[PDB]
Design an enzyme around this catalytic site. Structure first.
Site, PDB file in Angstrom:
ATOM      1  N   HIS A  41      62.832 -15.049  -7.784  1.00 37.59           N
ATOM      2  CA  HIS A  41      61.746 -16.051  -7.983  1.00 37.59           C
ATOM      3  C   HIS A  41      62.326 -17.383  -8.468  1.00 37.59           C
ATOM      4  O   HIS A  41      61.560 -18.362  -8.570  1.00 37.59           O
ATOM      5  CB  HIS A  41      60.581 -15.511  -8.838  1.00 37.59           C
ATOM      6  CG  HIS A  41      60.893 -15.277 -10.267  1.00 37.59           C
ATOM      7  ND1 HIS A  41      61.131 -14.016 -10.753  1.00 37.59           N
ATOM      8  CD2 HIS A  41      60.969 -16.122 -11.315  1.00 37.59           C
ATOM      9  CE1 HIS A  41      61.364 -14.095 -12.045  1.00 37.59           C
ATOM     10  NE2 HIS A  41      61.256 -15.369 -12.418  1.00 37.59           N
ATOM     11  N   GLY A 143      62.051 -19.130 -19.583  1.00 37.89           N
ATOM     12  CA  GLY A 143      63.507 -19.374 -19.546  1.00 37.89           C
ATOM     13  C   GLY A 143      64.345 -18.100 -19.661  1.00 37.89           C
ATOM     14  O   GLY A 143      65.558 -18.179 -19.449  1.00 37.89           O
ATOM     15  N   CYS A 145      64.173 -15.193 -18.017  1.00 40.26           N
ATOM     16  CA  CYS A 145      64.359 -14.464 -16.747  1.00 40.26           C
ATOM     17  C   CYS A 145      65.834 -14.494 -16.346  1.00 40.26           C
ATOM     18  O   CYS A 145      66.508 -15.534 -16.496  1.00 40.26           O
ATOM     19  CB  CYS A 145      63.465 -15.005 -15.633  1.00 40.26           C
ATOM     20  SG  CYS A 145      61.763 -14.442 -15.886  1.00 40.26           S
TER      21      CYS A 145
HETATM   22  C1  LIG Z   1      60.726 -15.990 -15.950  1.00 38.15           C
HETATM   23  O1  LIG Z   1      60.326 -16.400 -14.648  1.00 38.15           O
HETATM   24  C2  LIG Z   1      61.430 -17.143 -16.559  1.00 38.15           C
HETATM   25  O2  LIG Z   1      61.882 -17.074 -17.697  1.00 38.15           O
HETATM   26  N1  LIG Z   1      61.472 -18.230 -15.775  1.00 38.15           N
HETATM   27  C3  LIG Z   1      62.214 -19.471 -16.066  1.00 38.15           C
HETATM   28  C4  LIG Z   1      61.478 -20.710 -16.470  1.00 38.15           C
HETATM   29  C5  LIG Z   1      62.000 -20.581 -15.089  1.00 38.15           C
HETATM   30  C6  LIG Z   1      59.458 -15.628 -16.726  1.00 38.15           C
HETATM   31  C7  LIG Z   1      59.621 -14.914 -18.073  1.00 38.15           C
HETATM   32  C8  LIG Z   1      58.276 -14.713 -18.772  1.00 38.15           C
HETATM   33  C9  LIG Z   1      57.685 -15.995 -19.341  1.00 38.15           C
HETATM   34  C10 LIG Z   1      56.953 -15.579 -20.619  1.00 38.15           C
HETATM   35  N2  LIG Z   1      57.545 -14.280 -20.935  1.00 38.15           N
HETATM   36  C11 LIG Z   1      58.280 -13.769 -19.958  1.00 38.15           C
HETATM   37  O3  LIG Z   1      58.878 -12.727 -20.015  1.00 38.15           O
HETATM   38  N3  LIG Z   1      58.656 -14.819 -15.823  1.00 38.15           N
HETATM   39  C12 LIG Z   1      57.486 -15.224 -15.351  1.00 38.15           C
HETATM   40  O4  LIG Z   1      56.917 -16.237 -15.759  1.00 38.15           O
HETATM   41  C13 LIG Z   1      56.818 -14.357 -14.310  1.00 38.15           C
HETATM   42  C14 LIG Z   1      57.268 -14.697 -12.891  1.00 38.15           C
HETATM   43  C15 LIG Z   1      56.628 -13.811 -11.859  1.00 38.15           C
HETATM   44  C16 LIG Z   1      57.132 -12.419 -11.618  1.00 38.15           C
HETATM   45  C17 LIG Z   1      57.393 -13.488 -10.616  1.00 38.15           C
HETATM   46  N4  LIG Z   1      55.370 -14.519 -14.533  1.00 38.15           N
HETATM   47  C18 LIG Z   1      54.695 -15.503 -13.867  1.00 38.15           C
HETATM   48  C19 LIG Z   1      53.378 -15.696 -14.065  1.00 38.15           C
HETATM   49  C20 LIG Z   1      52.724 -14.944 -15.038  1.00 38.15           C
HETATM   50  C21 LIG Z   1      53.429 -13.962 -15.755  1.00 38.15           C
HETATM   51  N5  LIG Z   1      52.840 -13.155 -16.738  1.00 38.15           N
HETATM   52  C22 LIG Z   1      51.582 -13.298 -17.223  1.00 38.15           C
HETATM   53  O5  LIG Z   1      50.814 -14.172 -16.904  1.00 38.15           O
HETATM   54  O6  LIG Z   1      51.341 -12.308 -18.094  1.00 38.15           O
HETATM   55  C23 LIG Z   1      49.974 -11.895 -18.479  1.00 38.15           C
HETATM   56  C24 LIG Z   1      49.349 -13.049 -19.233  1.00 38.15           C
HETATM   57  C25 LIG Z   1      50.257 -10.709 -19.372  1.00 38.15           C
HETATM   58  C26 LIG Z   1      49.145 -11.494 -17.272  1.00 38.15           C
HETATM   59  C27 LIG Z   1      54.777 -13.725 -15.529  1.00 38.15           C
HETATM   60  O7  LIG Z   1      55.462 -12.912 -16.146  1.00 38.15           O
END
Ligand SMILES: *[C@](O)(C(=O)NC1CC1)[C@H](C[C@@H]1CCNC1=O)NC(=O)[C@H](CC1CC1)n1cccc(NC(=O)OC(C)(C)C)c1=O
Ligand SMILES: *[C@](O)(C(=O)NC1CC1)[C@H](C[C@@H]1CCNC1=O)NC(=O)[C@H](CC1CC1)n1cccc(NC(=O)OC(C)(C)C)c1=O
Ligand SMILES: [Cl-]
Lengths: 305, 304
Positions: A41, A143, A145
């Site tokens: 992603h 951040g 991930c």
């Molecule tokens: C990960 O993509 C990341 O760190 N990205 C870097 C900034 C570019 C994040 C890590 C999460 C952010 C908050 N806590 C985490 O562990 N992962 C994501 O944001 C997910 C990407 C999708 C799987 C492909 N992601 C996106 C959108 C929503 C959510 N979760 C969410 O909304 O959780 C609820 C509120 C419980 C439904 C998600 O995990």
């Protein structure tokens, strides 16, 4: 003396963490030999996240769209492929700090250390278990991930987890290093729910043995139980079934303490039926299920890496 | 989100750990530039340990008596001196993995990471608080002496603890890196015991703020208490007095959540007087006092 939730030393993994950038998205990559592994992603816009066609988005990318940074040094990407939910970036430089390693898929109840990273920089280390519902109870912000989970066997690092997402009630989901999710989850921004979680019975028993090793004996009773009679009570408290394999695995801890596994099970059955009556075990007011039998032996016998 | 007891990444310290052997005593040393730091009781036979005359024992040792191993490499010892309870072994080679570092003395209630080592090899890492009674609740076995505690601030390792001993109750005592004990403890085999401990009030409030930030908020109430009325109740439970300086140190967490410290103290007073009635906070059935306000900010704001 003393008993602590203990992580592996993270140095071998710290030397593998890099930053991976694709347009506007920055997250962590694992640099082993001449390959960087990261969540796929990294190629999405927030638009794409709702319902990404990953194969289609990746076609639109070139080697040059991937900015890989190892501290001050940019690593040149000379190739890319997707395996399941992970991207493999072939770089022109092998990591000189690559440890002996392998990729493993762990079972529910197994523990591992997480090196939490932001922008390719290690920030903290903690111990997790793969829950029976295939979540982990982590600590991860935006951040994080591409942060990885691992065990050390002597000098061999076994990578078992890469972080992808947060689920309801602040629990986390990710993949093995072949990019296959633990649990029925998908890397999409979509309503997803984990199953009801349960207590890792074999781990609770390991931790009661840790308790006896460390001089906490109060909960030991005069009874034994059958495995059947134990499971009848444990299922009533959302405990995982205890198998003969689990009884056999607790054998070495049983021999160390002189307390038969089924006698320890009779003590647990009484704790579940009566509660702890405001009393603590190893400084906890509830039964702890994130130490494996191996974790207890590791810590009580001081095995090193 | 989520909240875990988290240690610093240990790699910068792992690159400093060596094995120190003198006679039949093997423990851990810390190799920084051309000096190895270790507990001075490396020079004793258990014979010596009742009241060891360390100055006399050290005069009688040869540099040759100190076997220092860094992985596969033996380091030649070319000098030895004592500073308080720490032995300094001068070696012919400066550690090439020496990080930027300082020696600091921590205060009761502050936290640090422990790299537990055996035979100069890292075993595990965990977080400890310096207790108000100058003990730590660690996990240390025979051979763990010379394991260190540290904080990392950007690229700088602040070494604050070197492990020397276990006490009755399964707690631990050690020195700073100048070899001065935390608390009234001494490095000899003589029956010794920790004072009565106290709960680190400001840390429990920090952790309640961590719970709210993570959405664990059932214990919040519409009530407030004065600082005095709070301290009247909590001191009966053997909590440290909450000072205005503590209220100020909680300012960032109070501002982040919008919950005034004296609002939150009414929660804590109610938790002390009534217990949790079968609920948990951040998965604990007890009030946790080993997270500092800085630890909560760090983890909830992801500093690297
Ligand atoms: C990960 O993509 C990341 O760190 N990205 C870097 C900034 C570019 C994040 C890590 C999460 C952010 C908050 N806590 C985490 O562990 N992962 C994501 O944001 C997910 C990407 C999708 C799987 C492909 N992601 C996106 C959108 C929503 C959510 N979760 C969410 O909304 O959780 C609820 C509120 C419980 C439904 C998600 O995990
Ligand atoms: C340390 O010297 C060490 O690891 N040495 C290397 C093996 C050669 C040990 C560490 C402890 C052993 C078990 N867990 C530990 O943390 N430290 C000691 O043995 C102490 C040395 C003295 C400070 C100089 N030490 C000596 C004698 C007694 C005790 N404690 C003790 O008996 O504690 C009881 C059993 C709780 C009363 C002690 O710690
Ligand atoms: Cl608890």
């Amino acid at each position: 003396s003393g008993f602590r939730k203990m992580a592996f030393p993270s140095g071998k993994v710290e030397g593998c963490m890099v930053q991976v950038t694709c347009g506007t998205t920055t997250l962590n990559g694992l640099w082993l030999d001449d390959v960087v592994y990261c969540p796929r992603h990294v190629i999405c816009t927030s638009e794409d996240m709702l319902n990404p066609n990953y194969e289609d988005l990746l076609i639109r990318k070139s080697n040059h769209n991937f900015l890989v940074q190892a501290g001050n040094v940019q690593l040149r990407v000379i190739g890319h492929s997707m395996q399941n939910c992970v991207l493999k970036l072939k770089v022109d430089t092998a990591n000189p700090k690559t440890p002996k390693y392998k990729f493993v898929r762990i079972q529910p109840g197994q523990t591992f250390s997480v090196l939490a990273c932001y922008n390719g920089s290690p920030s903290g280390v903690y111990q997790c278990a793969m829950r029976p519902n295939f979540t982990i109870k982590g600590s991860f912000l935006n951040g994080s991930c591409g942060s990885v989970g691992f065990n050390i066997d002597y000098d061999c690092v076994s990578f078992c987890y890469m972080h992808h997402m947060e689920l309801p009630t602040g629990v986390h989901a990710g993949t093995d290093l072949e990019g296959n999710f633990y649990g029925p989850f998908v890397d999409r921004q979509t309503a997803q729910a984990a199953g009801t979680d349960t207590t890792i019975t074999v781990n609770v028993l390991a931790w009661l043995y840790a308790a006896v090793i460390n001089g906490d004996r109060w909960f030991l009773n005069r009874f034994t139980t059958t495995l059947n009679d134990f499971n009848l009570v444990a299922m009533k408290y959302n405990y995982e079934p205890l198998t003969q394999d689990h009884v056999d695995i607790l054998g070495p801890l049983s021999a160390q303490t002189g307390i038969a596994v089924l006698d320890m099970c009779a003590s647990l059955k009484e704790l579940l039926q009566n509660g702890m009556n405001g009393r603590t075990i190893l400084g906890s007011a509830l039964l702890e299920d994130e130490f494996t039998p191996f974790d207890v032996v590791r810590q009580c016998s001081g095995v090193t890496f």
